[PDB]
Enzyme design. Structure first.
Site, PDB file in Angstrom:
ATOM      1  N   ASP A  48       9.983  -1.259  12.200  1.00 47.28           N
ATOM      2  CA  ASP A  48      10.019  -0.932  11.113  1.00 47.28           C
ATOM      3  C   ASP A  48       9.097  -0.659  10.155  1.00 47.28           C
ATOM      4  OD1 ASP A  48      12.265  -0.016   9.068  1.00 47.28           O
ATOM      5  OD2 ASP A  48      12.891  -1.105  10.244  1.00 47.28           O
ATOM      6  N   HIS A  88      12.510  -2.142   3.811  1.00 43.89           N
ATOM      7  CA  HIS A  88      13.534  -1.962   4.883  1.00 43.89           C
ATOM      8  C   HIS A  88      13.502  -2.331   6.352  1.00 43.89           C
ATOM      9  CE1 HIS A  88      16.359   1.691   3.925  1.00 43.89           C
ATOM     10  NE2 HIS A  88      15.217   2.171   3.206  1.00 43.89           N
ATOM     11  N   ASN A 102      22.773   8.873  10.520  1.00 47.25           N
ATOM     12  CA  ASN A 102      23.680   8.745   9.088  1.00 47.25           C
ATOM     13  C   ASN A 102      23.550   9.495   8.972  1.00 47.25           C
ATOM     14  OD1 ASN A 102      22.516   5.576   9.457  1.00 47.25           O
ATOM     15  ND2 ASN A 102      21.113   6.279   8.114  1.00 47.25           N
ATOM     16  N   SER A 153      20.898   1.130  10.104  1.00 48.50           N
ATOM     17  CA  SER A 153      19.442   0.494  10.508  1.00 48.50           C
ATOM     18  C   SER A 153      20.324  -1.315  10.227  1.00 48.50           C
ATOM     19  CB  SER A 153      18.620   0.793   9.446  1.00 48.50           C
ATOM     20  OG  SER A 153      18.201   2.019   9.763  1.00 48.50           O
TER      21      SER A 153
END
Ligand SMILES: [Ca+2]
Ligand SMILES: [Ca+2]
Ligand SMILES: [Ca+2]
Length: 281
Positions: free
Chosen positions: A37, A70, A157, A220
């Protein structure tokens, strides 16, 4: 847990209503989650010294610190003390996305290869990222799973078919859609035959890059929930192959609980060792 946030609260039971408890028989001690990530804040209080750097393929250095948020958030959902699934897991940050969340396919591949090459004991990778088709990326993830490391992958998404997204579309991966606390599919979540299961991804509170906290939504946030129970499953059985883990996530999952599934298999993340509908049929 007496005051559990909703996502942890949901995965330890079959049905609504929520009971404000997250029950666990395991904590993922002895396993390592590789978080691919924006990096992770190793010093965050949620990790209690259990997160370390792996590598940083964006800046080519040894410090995989997070400057976006994130990757700290998804790492907190996997192994955060308060807001995590597996509360004694090891976290290894592998930074493939920049401070703005942008990354190249080459750098993400380098992180996937790095996980394949460096995993030692019981291990699980988490890829809360996605984008356009990429056989080269697909092929690297297919290869890391072949080496014996299970990869949890976010579905996307865009309210679209997850089969048009990499790495989501990789069959041997565990591709995760998102739900809310009303058991609806989150309205943004991807769907279809490439999605293996659903997990809490709407309004998830977890760690943030600045040492504090944040609540955000996305597949996520859903993915680390199931990576977290992969670590629960892996402590219970260290020798689970990717195939066996995928199977165990499938057969232990809560069935026919989710609404607006849009042709997705109706399976919801379940964190305990029960099979079918057992504990509450
Ligand atoms: Ca509960
Ligand atoms: Ca760095
Ligand atoms: Ca799959």
């Amino acid at each position: 847990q007496s005051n559990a946030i909703w996502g942890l609260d949901r995965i330890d039971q079959r049905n609504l209503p929520l009971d404000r408890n997250y029950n666990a028989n395991f904590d993922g001690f002895g396993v390592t989650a590789y978080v691919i990530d924006t990096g992770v804040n190793n010093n965050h209080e949620e990790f209690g010294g259990r997160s370390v750097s792996g590598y940083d393929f964006v800046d080519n250095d040894a410090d995989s610190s997070d400057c976006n948020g994130h990757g700290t958030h998804v790492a907190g959902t996997i192994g955060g003390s308060q807001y995590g699934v597996a509360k004694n897991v090891n976290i290894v940050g592998v930074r493939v996305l920049s401070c703005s969340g942008s990354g190249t396919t080459s750098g993400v591949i380098s992180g996937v290869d790095w996980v394949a090459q460096n995993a030692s004991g019981p291990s699980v990778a988490n890829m809360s990222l996605g984008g356009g088709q990429s056989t080269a990326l697909d092929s690297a993830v297919q290869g890391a799973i072949q080496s014996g490391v299970s990869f949890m992958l976010a579905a996307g998404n865009s309210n679209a078919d997850a089969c048009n997204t990499s790495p989501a579309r990789v069959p041997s991966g565990v591709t995760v859609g998102s739900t809310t606390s009303s058991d609806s599919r989150s309205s943004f979540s991807n769907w279809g035959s490439c999605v293996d299961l659903f997990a809490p991804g709407s309004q998830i509170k977890s760690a943030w890059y600045d040492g504090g906290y944040k609540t955000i939504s996305g597949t996520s946030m859903a993915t680390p929930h199931v990576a977290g129970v992969a670590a629960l499953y892996l402590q219970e059985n260290n020798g689970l192959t990717p195939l066996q883990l995928t199977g165990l996530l499938n057969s232990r999952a809560s069935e026919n609980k989710v609404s607006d599934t849009r042709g997705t298999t109706n399976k919801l993340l379940y964190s305990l060792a029960d099979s079918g509908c057992e504990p509450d049929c």
